[PDB]
Design a protein around this ligand. Structure first.
Ligand SMILES: Nc1nc(C(=O)O)c(CCc2ccccc2)s1
Ligand SMILES: [Zn+2]
Ligand SMILES: [Zn+2]
Length: 219
């Protein structure tokens, strides 16, 4: 009996969707993703945990005149991919990196129907960019950049106050990856993490600090 899916305007044409799980040992965890509008078309940046919540989310925007053109999953964990099966079931195109789909397959999960590879990928040319900084929270994690309003979705890689679940993490690489991300995206106006509140580009420095600290206090 946890809070319900929330949808909230972040900037013009950019919405944050927040869904909720109770995870043993952590308590209630929020999960943020985005819905990005381009004309009468909406793009999901990460899916909620469940089919149910992905249905709610899609319907919210359809009922407002938008076609759901596709969704992109920042990494293979359920908090980014839990809605792929329902989106596939609706013939909404789903995008994940080639590395994420191979991890979905190995984890016994349904994969995204469209895959991409490389450091930079345009989901929508000059409007929605995907960037791979390196392994960190997971081997596959990517971030999503909106050049318009200078908004960076960092997924579960942006971890300003603690790294979270390290089961699938690479703590060796994470400081390397986080320095790179800070370098590329220092001029972001807004940075959206998966599990804490939106902030500015200082969240990139905080993440780098948390990655260094986790490497150091790993010995
Ligand atoms: N679905 C969930 N993802 C994660 C994750 O680490 O990405 C969870 C751990 C909770 C946590 C999140 C942020 C900072 C500290 C702890 S739960
Ligand atoms: Zn994760
Ligand atoms: Zn997470």
């Amino acid at each position: 009996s946890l809070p319900d899916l929330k949808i909230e305007k972040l900037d013009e044409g950019v919405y944050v969707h927040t869904s909720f799980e109770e995870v043993n040992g952590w308590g209630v965890v929020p999960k943020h993703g985005l819905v990005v509008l381009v004309n009468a078309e909406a793009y999901l940046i990460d899916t909620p945990f469940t089919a149910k919540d992905t249905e709610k989310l899609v319907t919210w925007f359809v009922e407002r005149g938008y076609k759901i053109k596709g969704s992109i999953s920042s990494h293979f964990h359920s908090d980014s991919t839990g809605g792929i099966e329902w989106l596939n079931s609706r013939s909404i195109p789903t995008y994940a990196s080639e590395l994420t789909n191979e991890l979905l397959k190995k984890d016994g999960k349904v994969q995204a129907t469209n895959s991409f590879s490389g450091v930079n990928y345009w989901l929508v040319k000059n409007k929605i960019e995907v960037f791979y900084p390196g392994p960190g929270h997971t081997p596959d994690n990517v971030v999503v950049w909106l050049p318009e309003r200078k908004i960076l979705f960092g997924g579960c890689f942006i971890k300003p106050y603690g790294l979270g679940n390290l089961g699938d993490a690479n703590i060796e690489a994470w400081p390397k990856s986080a320095k790179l991300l800070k370098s590329k995206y220092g001029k972001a106006k807004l940075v959206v993490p998966s599990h804490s509140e939106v902030g500015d580009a200082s969240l990139l420095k905080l993440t780098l600090e948390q990655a260094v600290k986790g490497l150091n206090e790993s010995k």
